[PDB]
Amino acid sequence: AYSLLSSRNRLIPRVEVQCRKREWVKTDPDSPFLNGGREVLYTPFTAVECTVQPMRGKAIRDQNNQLMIGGEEDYDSYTVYSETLLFRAREGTEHLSDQMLLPDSGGGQTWFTVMKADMYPSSGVPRYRYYLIAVPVGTEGG
Amino acid sequence: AYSLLSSRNRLIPRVEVQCRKREWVKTDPDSPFLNGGREVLYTPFTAVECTVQPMRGKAIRDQNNQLMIGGEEDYDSYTVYSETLLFRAREGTEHLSDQMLLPDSGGGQTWFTVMKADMYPSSGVPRYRYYLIAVPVGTEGG
Amino acid sequence: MTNEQVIELVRVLLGGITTEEISDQTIIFFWTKWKLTYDLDNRPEKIPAALYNTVVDCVRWLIVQEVSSGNSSIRERFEKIGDETISVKSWESWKDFLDWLELNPDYIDPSLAFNSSLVIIGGVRKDEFFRVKNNPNSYNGFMEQGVYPTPAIPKQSAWP
Amino acid sequence: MTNEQVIELVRVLLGGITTEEISDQTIIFFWTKWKLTYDLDNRPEKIPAALYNTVVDCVRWLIVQEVSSGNSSIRERFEKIGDETISVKSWESWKDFLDWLELNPDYIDPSLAFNSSLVIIGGVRKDEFFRVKNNPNSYNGFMEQGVYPTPAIPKQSAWP
Amino acid sequence: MTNEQVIELVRVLLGGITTEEISDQTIIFFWTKWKLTYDLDNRPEKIPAALYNTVVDCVRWLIVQEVSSGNSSIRERFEKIGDETISVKSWESWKDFLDWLELNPDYIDPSLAFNSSLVIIGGVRKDEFFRVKNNPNSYNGFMEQGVYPTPAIPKQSAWP
Amino acid sequence: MTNEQVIELVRVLLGGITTEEISDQTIIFFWTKWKLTYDLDNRPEKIPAALYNTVVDCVRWLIVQEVSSGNSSIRERFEKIGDETISVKSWESWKDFLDWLELNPDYIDPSLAFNSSLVIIGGVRKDEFFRVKNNPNSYNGFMEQGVYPTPAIPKQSAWP
């Protein structure tokens, strides 16, 4: 079985990041809809150690500021290697996708939503790879 | 942690470049619009040391002079490695994307607008990569 | 010395060795071995001697711990479960340390009387000369009886 | 010397060594060991001797600190968790330094009287001649009794 | 020499060494060491001798500075945080310089009287012949007393 | 020689060495050192000797300038910040030159009287014979006094 990869690295620096779980709930008392007035509940936590890297190409959809008919919108993304388990959304449930807070190109800090998670069930070592997309500015995603 | 990359190179020559920050302001007193008569405010500065390189392919959109129904328009671009932090535009604000002055294929000098900025938050060393597009001839971009 | 100080002293001498590398049980096992062979309770003059043998025996058990496992026979490794790659390459280091430790016992206890009787010259001391001469079992050159014994040749080493 | 000066002096001599590499508790442990054996409070003449031995023991503990860990047995490394790759290939450096230090004790204290009695010639000094001659335990060539003792041959080394 | 000129002179001799590589405090520490052992204020004849030992001691501290850190044991490096790649490969250089400096003391001060008494032949000078002859502790070949002393053989080296 | 000519002469002899490689202040420092020791103003016969030593000391300072910096301990380089890659793999070059220069002093000044007294044979010149013979401190074979001094053997080397 794997031995070296089953232990923490000692050459490349790694950092911890903050995250938060997400659910949703219905608030309207009389509306007949599952949506109602949707609300999201958060529960914070942290990842043991992570590595953050940017997109490699220069494709038009990967550029940071984009020109739309309204104005120069904003976009960011990352690829993350981590030893913590993060989950995407699951259907027929009230759980949403986990989010984690990282620096952006504008100098601030914003939340990124997990979109793709990679796992190797037959190997055993707990090492994962994630792909993240920054939440739209002015909202908390979906 | 990284040591060698946390210091300035001593084999490949590097140069400094000039830049300028950009904001915008409304001038019309009575117009009800956020746009009004837009104006841009500049504040110059320089990058510590940079490397400039051209696009690698020959794709039709990367050629310098392009044939349009009006006349042989002009286009240029670059890829830049630098140790200075430059910012793109941010929404809901009055800040615009930074620009920097570089030589062009026509023998002159023109302003290039930052479009994509790459960062490695988990590594620590301040080394960045940018992708730039020359401002349209006869205007100051957007 | 009591049963608890020996572990405390051994670990400091061995550069703060951890518990998993050498258990406290194994230290007692070698410590108890020399206690009964040197009856330290009866004679406390062997405290440095028992301590020195205990540390050496522990190093011997450490060397054989690398053997009987996969650590000794491997000299390469390579892991890759995706983008993560690791490649690296104490059996050899523990060997020369044992040889070095056997040559510097003062590092354990300065009172071991090490390196005192290297050179011996005979017949230059009255104490040693009479010890051999008065030994009833000694047989020297003046006893050469020849073909058959004669009363003209001594049968004992000591002078009358 | 007081307990606080020794750490200050040893760290300077060892090129500003840090606390994590060698703790202040270990230095006191070796300092105390030579204090009780050389009763420095009783005789202050052993200040250079106890100081020189203390530093040497600390270097010995530094060498064994590389051993009992993974630092000694590895000579390669490779980390790759994406775009970050690092590869590099003090146990052996501390070895020859200990050998070098034992040959230049003046670096610790110049008053150690090092390298003073390399060549010894016997019988060229009255002080050395009479000390050997007047030793009651000495046995020299003029005592060859032969077959049986006779009163014509001296039984003591010293002249009447 | 005063406390400020020593740093100024040492740095020039060492090829303009920087402050971070060797602090001015460490230079004073070795300078003060030889001042008290050679009481330079009382006898100014040892200015070249104290200066030579000070520079040599500084080089010794420089060598041990490479040791006790990661600089000595590494001989490769590789950095890559993207498109930037760097690979390069003073402990070894400072070694032979110390050996070279110990063989050319004139580089520090020409008045050190270096290399003057290599070859010694005995009995070819009246000053040296009488110094040994008149020494009351000398024991020469004419004193061979034999089995027991006789008044026909001298007991003192000097002539009457 | 004046203070301005020496820099002009040294730079030409060293193959047009530049100011950054060796400053004009350092050259004066070594030039002044041999001026006060050889009082060139008092005796102008030492102009070649002081000039030869000045150049040698400058080469020594050049060697130690490679040391105390990163130039001596590196033998590889690799820069890659995109499409630009550079890779290359004077400390050792200055070494043998100093050895070569010490063997060809005529390159500095032909009037140094180099290589003139390699082979010496004694007793084949009247000038050398009488200088040794008439030396009052000389002790030769005709002074063998033996057991006790006698007036049949001379006490002075020179003939009456």
How many pairs of residues across B and D have Cβ atoms under 8 Å apart?
4
Q: Are B22 and B99 in contact (CB under 8 A)?
A: yes
Kindly give the pairing relationship between strand D79-80 and strand A77-82. Answer: unpaired
Phi-psi region of D115 (alpha: psi -120 to 50; beta: other; left: phi over 0): left
F20 token code pair: 């950054």
Q: Are E138 and E114 in contact (CB under 8 A)?
A: no
In this structure, how many other beta carbons lie within 10 angstroms of the beta carbon of residue C151? 6
Place of tokens 């960045």: B128
CA distance C143 to D46: 55
DSSP helix/strand/coil, B101: strand
Q: Are D128 and D122 in contact (CB under 8 A)?
A: yes
The amino acid at residue A92 is G
CA distance F121 to F114: 19
**Chain B: residues touching F (Cβ < 8 Å):** 9-14, 51, 53, 79, 81
Q: At what angle do helices D91-101 and D47-66 cross, to 10 degrees?
A: 160
Q: Could you tell me which of A95, A97, A76 has the C-alpha nearest to residue A19?
A: A97
CA distance E94 to B125: 31
Strands (E), E9-124: 79-80, 85-86
User: H or E stretch including D29?
Assistant: helix D24-38
**Chain A residue nearest residue D80, CA to CA:** A12
DSSP helix/strand/coil, B45: strand
Q: Could you tell me which of B8, E26, E145, B129 has the C-alpha nearest to residue D130?
A: E145
CA distance A83 to D70: 24
User: H or E stretch including F1?
Assistant: none
CA distance B8 to B126: 11
Q: Are E54 and E30 in contact (CB under 8 A)?
A: yes
Alpha helices in chain F (DSSP H): 3-13, 24-38, 47-66, 91-101, 126-133
Q: Could you tell me which of C57, C56, C51 has the C-alpha nearest to residue C8?
A: C51
A113 token code pair: 């939503």
**Chain C residue nearest residue A126, CA to CA:** C81
**Chain E residue nearest residue D21, CA to CA:** E68
CA distance F121 to D4: 66
Q: What is the largest CA-CA distance in chain C?
A: 99
Residue from the list B11, B53, B79 with its beta carbon closest to the beta carbon of F77 = B11
- Strands of E85-86's sheet in order across: E79-80, E85-86, F79-80, F85-86
Rg (CA), chain A: 18
Kindly give the pairing relationship between strand A77-82 and strand B109-118. Answer: unpaired
CA distance E119 to E134: 24
| A 89-118 → B contacts, CB under 8 A | 102-103, 105-108
DSSP helix/strand/coil, E21: coil
Which residues of chain D does B125 touch, with a Cβ-Cβ cutoff of 8 Å? none
Q: Could you tell me which of F121, F127, F158, F125 has the C-alpha nearest to residue F142?
A: F158
Q: Are B85 and B95 in contact (CB under 8 A)?
A: no
Whole-number Cα distances in Å, E50 to E10, E25, E110, F36, F88: 12, 17, 14, 20, 43
DSSP letter (8 states) at residue E118: -
**Chain B: residues touching D (Cβ < 8 Å):** 2, 120, 123
Resolution (angstroms) stands at: 12.7
Contact C84 A118 (CB under 8 A): no
Cβ neighbors of D156 (< 8 A, separation 6 or more) are D136
Contact B119 A102 (CB under 8 A): no
Whether chains D and F touch (3+ CB pairs under 8 A) is answered by: no
CA distance B59 to F100: 62
Whole-number Cα distances in Å, E138 to C92, E131, E152: 56, 10, 19
Whole-number Cα distances in Å, A20 to A86, A96, A131, B11, C108: 10, 11, 16, 46, 56
Secondary structure (DSSP) of C2-22: -TTHHHHHHHHHTTS--TTTS
Q: For chain A, what is the HEC assignment?
A: CCCHHHCCCCCCCCEEEEEEEEECECCCCCCCCCCCCCECCEEEEEEEEEEEECCCCCCHHHCCEEECCCCEEECCEEEEEECCCCCCCCCCCCECCCEEEEECCCCCEEEEEEEEEECCCCCCCCCEEEEEEECCCCCCCC
CA distance C3 to F114: 78
Whole-number Cα distances in Å, B124 to B1, B5, C153: 8, 10, 97
Q: Are D2 and D51 in contact (CB under 8 A)?
A: no
Q: Are A85 and A128 in contact (CB under 8 A)?
A: yes
D60 token code pair: 């010995």
Centroid of chain to Cα C110: 15
Interface test with D, best of A12, A15, A125, A130 (most D CBs within 10 A): A12
B95: β partners: B23
Q: Are E154 and E143 in contact (CB under 8 A)?
A: yes
CA distance A103 to A50: 14
CA distance D9 to D3: 11
The amino acid at residue E111 is S
Which residues of chain E does F82 touch, with a Cβ-Cβ cutoff of 8 Å? 83
Phi-psi region of F109 (alpha: psi -120 to 50; beta: other; left: phi over 0): beta
The amino acid at residue E140 is N
Q: Are A2 and A123 in contact (CB under 8 A)?
A: yes
Residue from the list B10, B11, B81 with its beta carbon closest to the beta carbon of F82 = B81
Cβ neighbors of F109 (< 8 A, separation 6 or more) are F48, F51, F52
3-state helix, strand, coil in chain E (%, to 5): 50, 5, 50
From B2's Cα to the closest Cα of chain E, the distance in A is 7
Q: Could you tell me which of A26, B9, D76 has the C-alpha nearest to residue C78?
A: D76
Which residues of chain D does C21 touch, with a Cβ-Cβ cutoff of 8 Å? 68
Contact C90 D77 (CB under 8 A): no
DSSP helix/strand/coil, C66: helix
Residue from the list B4, B9, B120 with its beta carbon closest to the beta carbon of E82 = B120
Q: At what angle do helices C5-13 and C47-66 cross, to 10 degrees?
A: 60
B40 token code pair: 């841009």
Secondary structure (DSSP) of C85-123: EE----HHHHHHHHHHHHH-GGGT-GGG--S------TT
Here the contacts of A114-117 (C-beta below 8 Å, separation 24 or greater) are A114/A86, A114/A87, A114/A88, A115/A88, A116/A88, A117/A86, A117/A87, A117/A88
Contact B118 A54 (CB under 8 A): yes
CA distance E103 to E100: 5
Q: Could you tell me which of B140, B32, B129, B142 has the C-alpha nearest to residue B85?
A: B129
Phi and psi of B104, rounded to 5°?
-120, 180
User: H or E stretch including E24?
Assistant: helix E24-38
CA distance D76 to B99: 45
Interface test with E, best of D20, D84, D89 (most E CBs within 10 A): D89
From B24's Cα to the closest Cα of chain E, the distance in A is 35
CA distance F29 to E108: 12
Cβ neighbors of E61 (< 8 A, separation 6 or more) are D15, E22, E26, E30
Centroid of chain to Cα D30: 13
Q: Are D84 and E80 in contact (CB under 8 A)?
A: yes
Whether chains E and C touch (3+ CB pairs under 8 A) is answered by: no
Contact B5 E77 (CB under 8 A): no
From E150's Cα to the closest Cα of chain F, the distance in A is 16
From F139's Cα to the closest Cα of chain E, the distance in A is 5
Phi and psi of F25, rounded to 5°?
-70, -40
How many pairs of residues across A and C have Cβ atoms under 8 Å apart?
27
Which residues of chain E does B125 touch, with a Cβ-Cβ cutoff of 8 Å? 81
In this structure, how many other beta carbons lie within 10 angstroms of the beta carbon of residue F6? 21
Centroid of chain to Cα F120: 22
CA distance B58 to B52: 18
Centroid of chain to Cα C120: 22
Whether chains E and D touch (3+ CB pairs under 8 A) is answered by: yes
CA distance D76 to D88: 6
Which residues of chain B does E88 touch, with a Cβ-Cβ cutoff of 8 Å? 4
The amino acid at residue F96 is D
Contact C127 D137 (CB under 8 A): yes
Q: Are E84 and F81 in contact (CB under 8 A)?
A: yes
Torsion of Cα atoms, D85 then D89 then D94 then D95, to 10°: 160
